[PDB]
Amino acid sequence: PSVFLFPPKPKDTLMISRTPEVTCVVVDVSHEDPEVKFNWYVDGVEVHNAKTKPREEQYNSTYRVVSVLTVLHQDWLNGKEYKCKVSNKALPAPIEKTISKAKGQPREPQVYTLPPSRDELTKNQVSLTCLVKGFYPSDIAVEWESNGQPENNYKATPPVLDSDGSFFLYSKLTVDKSRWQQGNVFSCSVMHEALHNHYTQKSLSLS
Amino acid sequence: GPSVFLFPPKPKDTLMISRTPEVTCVVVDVSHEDPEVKFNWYVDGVEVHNAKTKPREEQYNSTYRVVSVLTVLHQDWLNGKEYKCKVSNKALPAPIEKTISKAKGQPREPQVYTLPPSRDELTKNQVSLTCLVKGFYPSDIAVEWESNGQPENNYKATPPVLDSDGSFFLYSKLTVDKSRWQQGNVFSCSVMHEALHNHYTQKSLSLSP
Ligand SMILES: *[C@@H]1O[C@H](CO)[C@@H](O[C@@H]2O[C@H](CO)[C@@H](O[C@@H]3O[C@H](CO[C@H]4O[C@H](CO[C@H]5O[C@H](CO)[C@@H](O)[C@H](O)[C@@H]5O[C@H]5O[C@H](CO)[C@@H](O)[C@H](O)[C@@H]5O)[C@@H](O)[C@H](O[C@H]5O[C@H](CO)[C@@H](O)[C@H](O)[C@@H]5O)[C@@H]4O)[C@@H](O)[C@H](O[C@H]4O[C@H](CO)[C@@H](O)[C@H](O)[C@@H]4O[C@H]4O[C@H](CO)[C@@H](O)[C@H](O)[C@@H]4O)[C@@H]3O)[C@H](O)[C@H]2NC(C)=O)[C@H](O)[C@H]1NC(C)=O
Ligand SMILES: *[C@@H]1O[C@H](CO)[C@@H](O[C@@H]2O[C@H](CO)[C@@H](O[C@@H]3O[C@H](CO)[C@@H](O)[C@H](O)[C@@H]3O)[C@H](O)[C@H]2NC(C)=O)[C@H](O)[C@H]1NC(C)=O
């Protein structure tokens, strides 16, 4: 029986309207010993608000059991540690796992929208690029939209370590050439702890 | 006990005829007492006799490490031939065999596009010159920057990323002093990939006053 502990999603911790959660997932729980007990601690102090799922049988004949703790946005961002302790009768000592935000001094992202290269205008679809650089830690959300609605066809690269020890990434949005040439506006919005109000937005249009 | 690792050539070694692509078979945790290792090599089942093994390197836990390098024809690797390394030893029951070959899949030509820095970046000491490379398959690729026929190395590239059509893209960011950009220097983004004519293409980027 193994334990895997998951941090909340970055967008959820950066935005007070959303609800950040840490998730403790226990796998390889047997039929022979099918009950699990969780104990949840924030900075070593036991908490009691966790919601545990009823166990679910997998295709491989084992059980999956999941416990979810809601965390306060500011506790996560302030580096508090979350411990999930799991007990089972086929376990000599219970497994403990501990998670918290990436350590290190935060650096603020610099966001740059780059139009498509002149050479790409011969194609039916063009590439609008969002350079997000100079940020730390790596946890970040970068999204594209137009007229306040999420754009369909894009992908970000993973964050990459830069020479100064900060991170960068690129997000590529693909749009029909006509939509660009008709002069529609597109915006890359970025969320990160080091941004004022955890949010900045940069637009990009043909002119 | 004894393990074997089989490594492939560096993409660009295979992509330029002047360079020497190698398949490298490394053997580790060879016993202190009965060490002698023999290397057999095969290309599509057919034995080849030009591998250059190095004498054993004794470690600091009474274990030997014995590397063996096989030079490979460029066009063989690109044409999907299979390279088998066979390592035998007295302390093995069966000799260990490992096989390796190029990533499969229909090749697709990368498209290459240089993007200048956003005007919002010109308030900084250093600016970002960007090369987008998309539509390529397989992911094996080399991207490099230069100026005035000297390599320009203050750049980092992203990993290849699977795009929404099965092809890969990546970006490579070059960082240069703002002054160098403002003065009209040409920077170029070299791309090397099996699906490009002559395995090479190059795109340039300069300031427009
Ligand atoms: C019966 O069925 C059961 C049910 O299926 C089955 O259970 C399964 O068991 C296996 C192992 O036994 C479990 O495997 C584990 O999976 C974990 C979760 O993996 C996923 O998430 C990872 C992280 O994702 C974030 O981060 C990535 C990079 O950092 C990003 O790429 C992601 O996008 C994502 O980012 C997002 O979140 C960030 C915050 O986290 C945020 O910043 C960011 O912005 C963004 O929002 C991914 O890495 C991972 O992807 C892997 O797999 C896919 C293919 O599916 C590949 O394409 C990827 O490249 C990658 O390889 C998943 O999406 C893992 O964390 C866990 O890893 C650890 O354990 C393994 C060995 O098991 C180690 O090799 C590994 O190194 C990790 O351990 C290390 O650290 C610990 C301590 O920290 C250390 O002790 C250890 O020694 C080691 O160093 C592992 O792989 C699987 O989860 C179970 N499934 C389920 C459904 O529960 C069961 O086994 C079956 N029974 C059998 C087989 O008998
Ligand atoms: C005794 O000492 C030597 C040297 O420290 C150890 O050799 C090392 O063995 C590890 C374990 O397999 C090798 O790891 C391999 O690394 C490559 C990276 O390219 C990876 O692709 C492989 O999958 C694997 O993880 C490692 O290369 C090797 N070190 C060296 C310098 O060659 C050995 O394990 C030790 N033996 C013990 C502790 O019993």
From Swiss-Prot, chain A:
Post-translational modification: Glycosylation on Asn-60 is required for interaction with Fc receptors and ability to activate the complement pathway. (Microbial infection) Deglycosylation on Asn-60 by S.pyogenes EndoS or Endos2 endoglucosidases prevents interaction between immunoglobulin-gamma (IgG) and Fc receptors, impairing ability to activate the complement pathway.
Keyword hit for RNA-binding: no
Region feature (CH3): 104-207
Residue span of region CH2: 1-103
SS bond list: C24-C84, C130-C188
Superkingdom of source: Eukaryota
Keyword list, A-Z: Adaptive immunity, Cell membrane, Chromosomal rearrangement, Disulfide bond, Glycoprotein, Immunity, Immunoglobulin, Immunoglobulin domain, Membrane, Secreted, Transmembrane, Transmembrane helix
Ig-like domain segment(s): 1-100, 109-205
List of glycosylated residues: N60
GO cellular component, one term: immunoglobulin complex, circulating
GO molecular function: antigen binding; Fc-gamma receptor I complex binding; immunoglobulin receptor binding
Effect of L121M: In IMGT allele IGHG1*03
Coiled-coil stretches noted in the UniProt entry, renumbered to this chain: none
GO BP: any one term: adaptive immune response
Subunit structure: Immunoglobulins are composed of two identical heavy chains and two identical light chains; disulfide-linked. Interacts with FCGR1A; this interaction mediates IgG effector functions on monocytes. Interacts with FCGR2A and FCGR3A.
Connected disease: Multiple myeloma: A malignant tumor of plasma cells usually arising in the bone marrow and characterized by diffuse involvement of the skeletal system, hyperglobulinemia, Bence-Jones proteinuria and anemia. Complications of multiple myeloma are bone pain, hypercalcemia, renal failure and spinal cord compression. The aberrant antibodies that are produced lead to impaired humoral immunity and patients have a high prevalence of infection. Amyloidosis may develop in some patients.
Function: Constant region of immunoglobulin heavy chains. Immunoglobulins, also known as antibodies, are membrane-bound or secreted glycoproteins produced by B lymphocytes. In the recognition phase of humoral immunity, the membrane-bound immunoglobulins serve as receptors which, upon binding of a specific antigen, trigger the clonal expansion and differentiation of B lymphocytes into immunoglobulins-secreting plasma cells. Secreted immunoglobulins mediate the effector phase of humoral immunity, which results in the elimination of bound antigens.
Name under which the protein is recorded: Immunoglobulin heavy constant gamma 1
Covered residues, full protein: 121 to 327 of 399
Swiss-Prot record, chain B:
The Ig-like domain, residue ranges: 2-101, 110-206
Keyword Cell membrane annotated: yes
One Gene Ontology CC term in the entry: extracellular region
Outcome when changing D120E: In IMGT allele IGHG1*03
tRNA processing in keyword set: no
Origin: domain of life: Eukaryota
Glycosylated sites: N61
Region (CH2): 1-104
PTM section of the record: Glycosylation on Asn-61 is required for interaction with Fc receptors and ability to activate the complement pathway. (Microbial infection) Deglycosylation on Asn-61 by S.pyogenes EndoS or Endos2 endoglucosidases prevents interaction between immunoglobulin-gamma (IgG) and Fc receptors, impairing ability to activate the complement pathway.
Alphabetical UniProt keywords: Adaptive immunity, Cell membrane, Chromosomal rearrangement, Disulfide bond, Glycoprotein, Immunity, Immunoglobulin, Immunoglobulin domain, Membrane, Secreted, Transmembrane, Transmembrane helix
GO molecular function: antigen binding; Fc-gamma receptor I complex binding; immunoglobulin receptor binding
GO biological process: adaptive immune response; antibacterial humoral response; antibody-dependent cellular cytotoxicity; B cell receptor signaling pathway; complement activation, classical pathway; complement-dependent cytotoxicity
Cystine pairings recorded for this chain: C25-C85, C131-C189
Region (CH3): 105-209
Biological role stated in the UniProt entry: Constant region of immunoglobulin heavy chains. Immunoglobulins, also known as antibodies, are membrane-bound or secreted glycoproteins produced by B lymphocytes. In the recognition phase of humoral immunity, the membrane-bound immunoglobulins serve as receptors which, upon binding of a specific antigen, trigger the clonal expansion and differentiation of B lymphocytes into immunoglobulins-secreting plasma cells. Secreted immunoglobulins mediate the effector phase of humoral immunity, which results in the elimination of bound antigens.
Subunit structure: Immunoglobulins are composed of two identical heavy chains and two identical light chains; disulfide-linked. Interacts with FCGR1A; this interaction mediates IgG effector functions on monocytes. Interacts with FCGR2A and FCGR3A.
Associated disease: Multiple myeloma: A malignant tumor of plasma cells usually arising in the bone marrow and characterized by diffuse involvement of the skeletal system, hyperglobulinemia, Bence-Jones proteinuria and anemia. Complications of multiple myeloma are bone pain, hypercalcemia, renal failure and spinal cord compression. The aberrant antibodies that are produced lead to impaired humoral immunity and patients have a high prevalence of infection. Amyloidosis may develop in some patients.
Protein name according to UniProt: Immunoglobulin heavy constant gamma 1
Name of the coding gene: IGHG1
Part of the intact protein present: 120 to 328 of 399
